[PDB]
Design a binder for this molecule. Structure first.
Ligand SMILES: Nc1nc2c(ncn2[C@@H]2O[C@H](COP(=O)(O)OP(=O)(O)O)[C@@H](O)[C@H]2O)c(=O)[nH]1
Ligand SMILES: Nc1nc2c(ncn2[C@@H]2O[C@H](COP(=O)(O)OP(=O)(O)O)[C@@H](O)[C@H]2O)c(=O)[nH]1
Ligand SMILES: Nc1nc2c(ncn2[C@@H]2O[C@H](COP(=O)(O)OP(=O)(O)O)[C@@H](O)[C@H]2O)c(=O)[nH]1
Ligand SMILES: Nc1nc2c(ncn2[C@@H]2O[C@H](COP(=O)(O)OP(=O)(O)O)[C@@H](O)[C@H]2O)c(=O)[nH]1
Ligand SMILES: Nc1nc2c(ncn2[C@@H]2O[C@H](COP(=O)(O)OP(=O)(O)O)[C@@H](O)[C@H]2O)c(=O)[nH]1
Ligand SMILES: Nc1nc2c(ncn2[C@@H]2O[C@H](COP(=O)(O)OP(=O)(O)O)[C@@H](O)[C@H]2O)c(=O)[nH]1
Ligand SMILES: [Mg+2]
Ligand SMILES: [Mg+2]
Lengths: 151, 151, 151, 151, 151, 151
């Protein structure tokens, strides 16, 4: 079997604020498997592609500027319902609506600096994963705790 | 005052995944008192008795085999409303409906591998405590912080 | 921009139970700026002024006595919507109603020993700040991660 | 085959100060396997046998009373060189001589309240294990990470 | 007993890097009692008096400027051998000589940005305590865990 | 004036045991800057190159086999004295000789499963960085806390 995959990206503010280890640890503890990961400064064209569906938003140019202002940690996580559950772990788009215990709820304040990105549907995930990673960048291996995480 | 008690068991997957100390710490921090604790592999008959109310459910056989597949940490915790609060701390039966911050919300994914058990009512607690522990196994002592936790 | 501020006080039980560093860390991680902080045993008169609203309440004398029973860590934190968000972080007045992830949800059990105080509104905040701190005690400085927390 | 084993006991002060989960987590993270564990108030006679080699020391009577003053968490941990390594993890007998990073270096101050006990040699471990546990109390199972901890 | 006390200050870089709660937590966990605490930006004259014996050193002017560049958390901690032990917990003056497990070993890199200060002797401690605090700012209370930390 | 750089790789056992976030966090807290990072399963040929100096050692074939048995997190960290300090943080080659507080001292037991690699000299670091990364994979940005970590 092949389980669901989602695209998670730690934004420049998460890297600048030293929260990379803390964020990854939350996904590891939950039981998800890390499939791919790289560190890079994404180009504006790339980011425009990534946030294309928002190209007509007022905040769009500023968003792209900021996502290009520093490096990003791009990752692919695998697991049962990882897309929806990953979204629950992140919190709401606006940290102000996020609850303590969530990543945005514990670590940030403003929607313009909300430290992380997570695909909002399987459909987006597949598109984002293809945008940021070559197929040969996805590593398949089996977690030793697999049978202790799944029936 | 003779306070309320609940029965909590870390399931085989919690032990296998190295979460014993992490889970116990959550109860200590909260202010609850550890009354009893032992480590053992429960027999299938012992497990059917614990979950006797689920005997006619389709998943019953696989639940018993899973619970017998490794050791369990059985504990009794005491405190004001510990039954109901212990339940809130665990999260929902299905990790997918559990919120970040709860034990199942932070550490597991699937209902069949949901790392922990907590009595659901005082009636159930008293029954589970009697099934798992001999009266001489419950320890009575007073916490030094008692007056800082209770009025 | 001279942002919003709130008064947070770690009650005597929070100090006695060794939770000072743990609580402060939660505010620092979130991105709030520490503006003032002092450690003191507040007098009864000073405490009756602080909780002047609940003077007619039955628990009042008990509250004042416990608040005076040990030292308190008084602080002022600054940030966008810090008053409302600080309240979300603390949880409900009653630890029983506070969710895991919040300060009261993770660390305490009873309303009479609920480890921390946070202003409930901007107006209460301004009043409590004036009551607990002299103007020279509010320190002026900028956080190096300011631009990573705010747009 | 069967690896080395050591007896570890969290003293009454470790339980009272809420460090049970924290200490257990240190052994789990290291990769050691928990073999047995129970919570009890040890009798004075049992404690005199345990510390029989120190019966003529001036602190002996006080050591026995303090060890009997509250419950203890008795455990058996298994692993390659666990006796000697368990000792390095604990720190020196006197917390004053223990380095930060060790259990006593991090959590305590005085030799008379040094929170934990660990066997000092394979011979002692075998004697203490026999003194505190019945054969049926040592659980047999294999860790899922075993092949990731050992060649 | 009249327990020994030491002066600890978290330097401007510790505050800026969000390490205040983390540092305080280490002293609380160890069993030391917080006696006094305040947050302030010290004047250059105040800092020259504090570091008076280093007035002829090359780095002195740079040290006084850095220390005045942001606020400081000034604290007094109490405990058996707290002066010498607090020093052990800090690590070496040069973070590069500091071992993992110590505060400087874990959190910093360069001698000119070494996040914390601790008195180097009882004589110095008493002099620094007098310099930074007035008598009425040192709070006396007894920790509830006192008898579990000391014989 | 660019700073020293070192090559750090989390071995297959570190990934399998869910320690990726925990390890990265230790380097972030210390004040080092992440320059490059990728997740991959290294080929045997790549691994022989990496450990070419040990090719005639008895344990060499087994080393290469295990290093290829799972994915590796390859990273480049930058900072003052990062090569020697990264080494101190890792601990000794044999975990048995590693002190608590170090990565190997806290997380592993045997030399053949010692979770992490770190360049041992500046010369080794430059060779390893060239072997694992392309020049365009190294990201240059400045940390917002730079002036609080360095004079
Ligand atoms: N500056 C600013 N950016 C926003 C706003 N709403 C959305 N964004 C940002 O653009 C990202 C994409 O928006 P959206 O797809 O709705 O949110 P997400 O999928 O939860 O990240 C959000 O994470 C924020 O970084 C806004 O009102 N102001
Ligand atoms: N596979 C599986 N196991 C289930 C299901 N519902 C319950 N269980 C298991 O049964 C245990 C006991 O069920 P129950 O008493 O209803 O829930 P709990 O008290 O919340 O644990 C749960 O904790 C799960 O391990 C289900 O539909 N599927
Ligand atoms: N003993 C006791 N104290 C209470 C009760 N309700 C409130 N308090 C105390 O009074 C404090 C202030 O009350 P309130 O303004 O209602 O809540 P808060 O603003 O959330 O602290 C509470 O935090 C408690 O310490 C109660 O029913 N009993
Ligand atoms: N009060 C008191 N207890 C001591 C003293 N020396 C040793 N002990 C206690 O004796 C225990 C057993 O002593 P020992 O075998 O020498 O040390 P250990 O094997 O490192 O625990 C120590 O752990 C302390 O709890 C002392 O001087 N005073
Ligand atoms: N910039 C710089 N500061 C130094 C140097 N040596 C000492 N200092 C600073 O001077 C402070 C006090 O020095 P000292 O009293 O000798 O060390 P401490 O008591 O361990 O802090 C140290 O904590 C450093 O912040 C140095 O060589 N360069
Ligand atoms: N199985 C095994 N592997 C070893 C032994 N010594 C070294 N290694 C492995 O080889 C790697 C390379 O060794 P070396 O460069 O000497 O030490 P390092 O620089 O500290 O990693 C080590 O980190 C261990 O994984 C040994 O005796 N047995
Ligand atoms: Mg001995
Ligand atoms: Mg080598």
């Amino acid at each position: 079997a092949n389980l669901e995959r989602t695209f998670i990206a730690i934004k420049p503010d998460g890297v600048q604020r030293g929260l990379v280890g803390e964020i990854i640890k939350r996904f590891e503890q939950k039981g998800f498997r890390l499939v791919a990961m790289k560190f890079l400064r994404a180009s504006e064209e790339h980011l425009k592609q990534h946030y294309i569906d928002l190209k007509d938003r007022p905040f769009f140019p500023g968003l792209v500027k900021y996502m290009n202002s520093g490096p990003v940690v791009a990752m692919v996580w695998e697991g049962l319902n990882v897309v929806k559950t990953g979204r629950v772990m992140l919190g709401e788009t606006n940290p102000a609506d996020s609850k303590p215990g969530t990543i945005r709820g514990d670590f940030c304040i403003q929607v313009g600096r909300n430290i992380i990105h997570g695909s909002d549907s399987v459909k987006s995930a597949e598109k984002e994963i293809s945008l940021w990673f070559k197929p040969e960048e996805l590593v398949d291996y089996k977690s030793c705790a697999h049978d202790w995480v799944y029936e």
